Every structure is written in structure tokens, then in C-alpha cells.
Design a binder for this molecule. Structure first.
Ligand code: G3A
Ligand code: SAH
Length: 261
């Protein structure tokens, strides 16, 4: 029924070439070449990002969609791209990242970009069962894509359900991935969360067209259904005649070193 649900259905009908072209059509992409080479050779002091996630969070942060301050908690940190980005910001005092890091799930990577010493990584942790703790900035980048819209809806509502427990503790800032903002139950949960905690959902330009993910952030407030549909309209427009044309941009390079007294 929603424009987004139609989008998912049409997405699944695309042929191999069209899907490949479609996913990167008119999107922005950071050049990960140098970063990947450094990481692969064991370099930990060049300030390169451990994943594409660092650039994603930087985009939100640099334009006020989320302030990174004080005690930061990163649910589903994976390799740690968001933890390292937050750790390098002066306003941040500490970072706790939690992730599964098991059975194929990315484990935290160890590099020494600025503030690596203020991050405490913990793997083998299912954040749905992790007891909420008080923090100032809450981050969560969880949401596994599924060809089934019903399934993406279920996974998204589960993430928001868990995240609400943490926001309820009282947080100033947040940036939470919403896998399928186009699903009706999700739209309603977002409207309820907005009334309780404020914020709104924003589409990151670094996201590929093959996913409708948007992020629930604290730095702005807008009409949820309107903006989710604006993104649905954009995604459907790009599916008409995929060019695979991408805009390459410089990846994030952070300063290096420990943050000491
Ligand atoms: N028409 C197509 N749609 C595709 C394809 N691969 C993915 N998708 C769609 O994009 C969505 C995002 O894909 P992404 O690779 O970024 O996320 P996942 O790694 O979690 O993909 P899954 O949703 O987990 O799918 C697993 C695999 O299943 C295959 N798959 C998934 N959907 C399809 C379809 N519709 N047609 C053909 N083959 C399909 C494909 O090889 C996928 O890699 C996915 O949920 C699908 O709705 C594809 O080859 N063709
Ligand atoms: N229930 C759960 N508990 C903890 N971690 C989970 C989880 N479900 C998924 N994850 C992890 O969440 C991560 C999402 S990808 C996160 C990327 C990160 N923002 C970066 O910048 O690198 C994956 O590693 C996935 O394994």
C-alpha cells in the first residue's frame, strides 16, 4: 500500500544488470581504496576508517542531525566505524560499543585513530538482551536487509522496540538506523517515538538504492510520513532507467593518537 512497499516489490523484479546498475545510480560513495589497502597491510596509525560507516555518521554529524557528546553507546558497532568517529570528537568523553562479533558477524577492528583509548569494545553481545545503561549519545546501526518487506518490517520494529528502552533512560542525542521506514507499523512507531523523544528520520546520501534505510536522529524534526515518501519517490524514480552513475568522494581520515590528560 505505501509507496515504499511498492518500491520493494518492484526492486525484487529487476534483472541482474538493472539491479546492479540501480543500486549505485546517482548515489555518493567514498573511495575506500586506500583505506582498505592500509588495513589489509596492518597499518593502524594512518587514521583511515575501518568501514564505510565512518563516512555515514560523519555526514549526519557535520550537518547537525546528531550531536556526539559525552557518554556514547554504539549498539551493533561491528568493525567500529561509528565508535572510532565518535571517539575522535572533542565533545565525546567515552565510547562503549557492543556487537555480536560471532558466527560470521563482523568483529571490532583495532586501529589507533584519535581517542581509540576511550573506546571499550565488547563482542559476543546481543544488544536486544543487553541491560540499558545511562548515556548521553545513543547510536545504533542495526538492520539486516530482506527480500521480504514483511521481514524487514519485523526486524525494524524489533530494533525500535529495543532502542526505546535505551532512550527511556534519558538521552540527549541519538542516531538509529531504521531499516524499513516505509512499512506502516514502522511509520506509526516513528510517529509515536517522535512525540515522546523528538527527532525525525533522514535519508543518508551514502545509502545505496537497494535499501530504503533512513536514520532516526535527534537533530531535526519533520513530518515523518512526508519525508519517508519523498525518499520512496526518489528511489522509484532512479529505478526507471538506472545508469549506475556514482559520485566518488574522499573517505574520512581522522587524526591519530591517544587522548590523554
Ligand atoms: N532483483 C534483485 N533484487 C535484489 C538482488 N539482490 C538483492 N536484491 C534486493 O535488494 C535488497 C538489498 O540487497 P543487499 O544485498 O544489499 O542485502 P542482503 O545481502 O541482506 O540481501 P538479502 O535481502 O539478504 O538477499 C540475499 C541474496 O538473495 C538474492 N536475492 C535477493 N532478492 C532477490 C531477487 N529479488 N531476485 C533475485 N535474487 C535475489 C541475492 O543473491 C542476494 O544477495 C534485497 O533485500 C532484495 O530485495 C538481485 O540480485 N536482484
Ligand atoms: N542483535 C545484535 N546485537 C549486537 N550486534 C548486532 C546484532 N544484530 C546485528 N548486529 C551487528 O550490527 C552490526 C551492523 S553494521 C554496523 C557498522 C558500524 N556502524 C560501522 O560504522 O562500522 C553488524 O556487525 C551486525 O553483526
Amino acid at each position: 500500500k505505501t509507496l515504499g512497499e511498492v518500491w520493494k516489490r518492484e526492486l525484487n523484479l529487476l534483472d541482474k544488470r538493472q539491479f546492479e546498475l540501480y543500486k549505485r545510480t546517482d548515489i555518493v560513495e567514498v573511495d575506500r581504496d586506500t583505506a582498505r589497502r592500509h588495513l589489509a597491510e596492518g597499518k593502524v596509525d594512518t587514521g583511515v576508517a575501518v568501514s564505510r560507516g565512518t563516512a555515514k555518521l560523519r555526514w549526519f554529524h557535520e550537518r547537525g542531525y546528531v550531536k556526539l557528546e559525552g557518554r556514547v553507546i554504539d549498539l551493533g558497532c561491528g568493525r567500529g566505524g561509528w565508535c572510532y568517529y565518535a571517539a575522535a570528537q572533542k565533545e565525546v568523553s567515552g565510547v562503549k560499543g557492543f556487537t555480536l562479533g560471532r558466527d560470521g558477524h563482523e568483529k571490532p577492528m583495532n586501529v589507533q585513530s584519535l581517542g581509540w583509548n576511550i573506546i571499550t569494545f565488547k563482542d559476543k553481545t546481543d544488544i536486544h538482551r543487553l541491560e540499558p545503561v545511562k548515556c548521553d549519545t545513543l547510536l545504533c546501526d542495526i538492520g539486516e536487509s530482506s527480500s521480504s518487506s514483511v521481514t524487514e518490517g519485523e526486524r525494524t520494529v524489533r530494533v525500535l522496540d529495543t532502542v526505546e528502552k535505551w532512550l527511556a533512560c534519558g538521552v540527549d542525542n541519538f542516531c538509529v538506523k531504521v531499516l524499513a521506514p516505509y512499512m506502516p507499523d514502522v511509520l506509526e512507531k516513528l510517529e509515536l517515538l517522535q512525540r515522546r523523544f523528538g527527532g525525525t528520520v533522514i535519508r543518508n546520501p551514502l545509502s545505496r538504492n537497494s535499501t530504503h534505510e533512513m536514520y532516526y536522529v535527534s537533530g531535526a524534526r519533520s513530518n515523518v510520513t512526508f519525508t519517508v515518501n519523498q525518499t520512496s519517490r526518489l528511489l522509484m524514480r532512479r529505478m526507471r532507467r538506472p545508469t549506475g552513475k556514482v559520485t566518488l568522494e574522499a573517505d574520512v581520515i581522522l587524526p591519530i593518537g591517544t587522548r590523554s590528560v
